[PDB]
């Protein structure tokens, strides 16, 4: 037969009769001719009959095909369509042409097997459909043993070919539709080799999200897409995926497995090298496991079936929990996060490429510092984003501050309402040539000019904004000269390697020069940029960071080292007490900023002695130097230190016991409390095993939770005192 899904392309028969109905129409026509496409029909546009399908290239058969079934006899809504003589037309011809494809039921492209003697509008080779070679032959030529679960594309073999929702690689940034990147390239490449590395080849390690590890895969794909590849790796494709029409199936199972298992089969067949990394099921499965592949691919790894993993380590270890063949098939790649130092060039590179988002210009550097300075201040975040985060945020606040150009606007909010008000009241008053107030009518001189000379400011603040528009907006185009070219070299093009490099190089630098050179100067503010139409981080961050955090204003600056000196030398001024402590303390800060100090671990320091006293300001006043929320510090009681561990600070329940809020206490705090000190009862009385445990963790300024999550920001101090 044809299929269960035959509705669509099969629906157009009564649609062909749709002029008026029909006592029946005929298998000379149907919307399956057009199928879902308005030219040649899926198959005889592309799918089956595109190249080889004989007649009806685009409008060939379908253009005039409707002549047969148009209009009824008398049909208000009596009837629609029916094959009649065509009823048995494909009946055996639907199930005959299948042979053994590794398939299930009757085929519409199987019904496309033998076509028909004459049912159609066309002359090609016969009275049958299209011309020749299509359907069962074309499909068999063009494919095999694959249609759809119980059904498929309506009338016609089926336009459906690849796995429904794909997320491109090859052609993805083939257009540069994604970005250049730097990152872990070899570090990556290392993997990427090993992505081949045979027998067990995929990475099946990775640390933790957020940073472009995705974006890696692409930069991965890059040299891959650069198609300079290990031949064994040479070809490939992925779409590293999630989800589907999946919830689509109501209450059914593996709606994935539905497309998915066929997707396997999609991928199963040959298609040369095509890489099947999906993404997250690692995170998935678990409980309420869906076994997308998780049972099957492990076997269905089968012949050369290639999927290359991405995830969080503890999340990963969260399957070290599940374990199993999660051992096998599974391999080892870390991740990292770099130094801002490392980071900037990235930060550098495409921020302009980004910038165009805001169509502004960028400042240079301290940004990044200030960003890293910032990075210190919202550190839960990934490194790179942070920029991006601030960046656009900056750019935003900028764009707010700037792109919204709300300088004149607030003026022109007030000053267009300050233009015509005071006008009519300044002309008259009782004392004219007498002296009581002799400035009386001076108040109209620049008043008439208030919004009036804001028109020059409308001019200016647009003028050199178009002096800034010329600056940025010309580039963004002129950007795409060298931009597209680098992607336009795509064939090893000397048409690209000369022409648009010419069209670049003569044009670019000149027009590059022009724009800042078309920024002359300004007397009110710096240079012809009126809004200044650029970005000063410090500024840009200040509020930002504020509107991130809190009153910087000291943090309107960094010296801190002198502050080290002075706040210290002044800790008196805020303490007046045991001074030498301050030193060692501050020395520890010097240490804290030594870093020539052993990187390991924040300072130890004293037990002080007694309580309820400067100890407490002592206890407090610390970040009063530093981070100046001494709200901060965490606490413990030696009392709380039992003779077994529950202790919910850290650890607590980790494996299989009751609750995972257990032990997060500090962590999640520490997580979002990357800087503090702790408290314990004098730290003194603490339970001995704890004392180990505490010092156990207290020692080693690099650790990870008893729940298995990184400990020791180690920058952050504790010193507890007894």
354 interacts with its own copies by CB under 8 A: yes
Which of its own copies, ligand AGS, none does residue 182 bind (CB under 5 to 8 Å by kind)?
Answer: ligand AGS
When CB distances are held under 5 to 8 angstroms depending on the partner's kind, the choice from ligand AGS, its own copies, none that residue 214 binds is ligand AGS
610 is in an annotated binding site: yes
For ligand AGS (CB under 6 A), the number of binding residues is: 17
Closer to its own copies by CB, 345 or 409: give it: 409
Q: Consult the annotation and say whether 609 binds a ligand.
A: yes
CB burial string 36-72: b at 16+ within 10 A, e below? bbebbbbbbbbbbbbebbbbbbeebbbeebbebbeeb
Query: Binding of ligand AGS at residue 350 (CB under 6 A)?
Result: yes
CA proximity to 32, closest of 19, 52, 20, 16: 16
Confirm whether residue 210 is marked as ligand binding. yes
Q: How far apart are CA 568 and CA 545, in angstroms?
A: 25
CA torsion 456-458-462-464 (nearest 10°) is 30
| 209 in contact with ligand AGS (CB under 6 A) | yes
27 binds ligand AGS (CB under 6 A): no
Any contact of residue 359 with its own copies (CB under 8 A)?
yes
Q: Work out what residue 547 binds among ligand AGS, its own copies, none; the CB cut-off runs from 5 to 8 Å by kind.
A: its own copies
Q: Write down the least CB distance from residue 59 to its own copies, Å.
A: 5
Interaction between residue 706 and ligand AGS (CB under 6 A): no
Q: Which two tokens stand for residue 580?
A: 């030498």
How far apart, in Å, are the Cα atoms of 125 and each of 26, 130, 302?
20, 9, 45
For its own copies, the closer CB: 56 or 93: 56
Q: How many residues make contact with its own copies (CB under 8 A)?
A: 101
Min separation Cβ 497 and its own copies, Å: 5
Q: Which does 494 bind (CB under 5 to 8 A by kind): its own copies, ligand AGS, none?
A: its own copies
How many CB atoms are located within 10 Å of the residue 231 CB?
Answer: 8
For residue 348, the minimal CB distance to ligand AGS (Å) is 9
- Residue 426 interacts, among ligand AGS, its own copies, none and using kind-specific CB cut-offs from 5 to 8 Å, with its own copies
Residues 6+ apart with CB under 8 A from 6: 108, 151, 152, 154, 155
**Smallest gap from residue 190 Cβ to ligand AGS (A):** 16
> What would the two tokens of residue 600 be?
């390991």
Sole binder of ligand AGS in the list 72, 83, 384, 664 (CB under 6 A): 384
- The answer to whether 27 and 119 are in contact (CB under 8 A) is yes
Alpha-carbon span 221 to 273, nearest angstrom: 13
C-alpha radius of gyration, the chain, whole number: 36
Site string for ligand AGS, 156-185 (x = CB under 6 A): -----------------------xxxxx--
Binding of residue 116 to its own copies (CB under 8 A): no
Report angle CA 155, 157, 163 to the nearest 5 degrees: 110
Residue 400 as a binder of its own copies (CB under 8 A): the answer is yes
**What interhelical angle do 454-488 and 501-517 show, nearest 10?**
160
What are the structure tokens assigned to 687, written together?
Answer: 């339970």
- The whole-angstrom separation of Cα 557 and Cα 29 is 78
**Contacts of its own copies in 681-720 (CB under 8 A):** none
Question: Out of 5, 110, 402, 468, which residue is the one contacting its own copies (CB under 8 A)?
Answer: 402
215 sits near ligand AGS (criterion: CB under 6 A):
yes
- Known binding residues for ATP are 207-214, 609-616
Binding site for ligand AGS (CB under 6 A): 179-183, 209-215, 346, 349-350, 384-385
């Amino acid at each position: 037969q044809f299929t269960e899904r035959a509705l669509t392309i099969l629906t157009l028969a009564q649609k062909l009769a749709s002029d008026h109905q029909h006592p029946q129409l005929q298998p000379i026509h149907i919307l399956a001719a057009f199928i879902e496409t308005p030219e040649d029909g899926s198959v005889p546009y592309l799918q089956n009959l595109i190249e080889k399908g004989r007649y009806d290239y685009d409008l060939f058969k379908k253009v005039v095909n409707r002549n047969l079934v148009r209009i009824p006899q008398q049909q208000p809504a009596p009837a629609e369509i029916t094959p009649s003589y065509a009823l048995g037309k494909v009946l055996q011809d639907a199930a005959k042409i299948q042979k053994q494809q590794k398939d299930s039921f009757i085929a519409q492209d199987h019904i496309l097997f033998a076509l028909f003697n004459d049912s159609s509008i066309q002359q090609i080779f016969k009275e049958a459909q299209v011309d020749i070679e299509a359907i069962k032959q074309q499909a068999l030529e063009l494919r095999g043993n694959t249609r759809i679960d119980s059904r498929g594309a309506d009338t016609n073999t089926p336009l459906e070919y690849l796995s429904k929702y794909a997320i491109d690689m090859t052609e993805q940034a083939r257009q540069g539709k994604l970005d250049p990147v730097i990152g872990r390239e070899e570090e990556i490449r290392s993997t990427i080799r090993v992505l081949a590395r045979r027998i067990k080849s995929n990475p099946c390690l990775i640390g933790e999200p957020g940073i472009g590890k995705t974006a890696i895969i692409e930069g991965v794909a890059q040299r891959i897409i650069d198609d300079d590849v290990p031949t064994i790796l040479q070809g490939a494709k992925l779409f590293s995926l999630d989800l589907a029409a999946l919830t689509a199936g109501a209450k059914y199972k593996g709606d994935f497995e539905e497309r998915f298992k066929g997707v396997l089969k999609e991928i199963e067949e040959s298609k040369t090298l095509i890489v099947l990394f999906i993404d997250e099921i690692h995170m998935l499965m678990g409980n309420g496991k869906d076994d997308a592949a998780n049972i099957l691919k492990p076997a269905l790894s089968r012949g050369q079936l290639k999927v290359i993993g991405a995830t969080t380590n503890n999340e990963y270890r969260s399957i070290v929990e599940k374990d199993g063949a999660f051992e096998r098939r599974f391999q080892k790649i870390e991740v990292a996060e770099p130094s801002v130092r490392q980071t900037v060039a990235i930060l550098r590179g495409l921020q302009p490429k980004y910038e165009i988002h805001h169509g502004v210009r960028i400042l240079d550097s301290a940004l990044v510092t200030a960003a890293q300075l910032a990075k210190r201040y919202l550190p839960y975040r990934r490194l790179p984003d942070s920029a991006l985060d601030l960046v656009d945020i900056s750019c935003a606040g900028v764009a707010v501050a700037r792109d919204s150009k709300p300088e004149e606007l607030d003026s022109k909010e007030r000053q267009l309402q300050l233009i015509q008000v005071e006008i009519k009241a300044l002309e008259r008053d009782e004392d004219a040539d007498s002296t009581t107030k002799d400035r009386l009518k001076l108040a109209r001189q620049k008043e008439a000019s208030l919004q009036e000379e804001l028109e020059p400011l409308r001019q200016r603040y647009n003028e050199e904004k178009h002096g800034h528009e010329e600056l940025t907006q010309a580039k963004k185009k002129l950007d795409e000269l060298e931009n597209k070219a680098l992607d336009a070299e795509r064939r090893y093009d000397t048409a690209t390697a000369a022409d648009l490099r010419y069209f670049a190089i003569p044009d670019i630098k000149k027009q590059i020069e022009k724009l800042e050179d078309q920024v002359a100067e300004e007397e009110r503010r710096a240079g012809a940029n009126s809004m200044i139409q650029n970005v000063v981080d410090s500024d840009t961050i200040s509020e930002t960071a504020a509107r991130l955090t809190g009153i910087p204003v000291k943090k309107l600056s960094e010296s801190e080292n002198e502050k080290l000196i002075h706040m210290e030398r002044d800790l008196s001024s805020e303490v007046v007490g045991q001074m030498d402590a301050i030193k060692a303390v501050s020395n520890a800060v010097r240490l804290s900023r030594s870093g020539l100090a052993n990187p390991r671990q924040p300072a130890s320091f004293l037990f002080l002695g007694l309580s309820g006293s400067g100890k407490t300001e002592l206890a407090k006043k610390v970040a009063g130097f530093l981070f100046n929320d001494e709200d901060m510090m965490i606490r413990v009681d030696c009392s709380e230190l039992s003779e077994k561990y529950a202790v919910s600070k850290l650890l607590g329940t980790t494996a299989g016991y009751v609750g995972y809020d257990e032990g997060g206490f500090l962590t999640n705090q520490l997580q979002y409390k990357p800087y503090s000190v702790l408290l314990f009862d004098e730290v003194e009385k603490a339970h001995p095993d704890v004392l180990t445990v505490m010092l156990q963790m207290l020692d080693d300024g690099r650790i990870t939770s008893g729940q298995g999550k990184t400990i020791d920001c180690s920058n952050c101090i504790v010193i507890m005192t007894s």
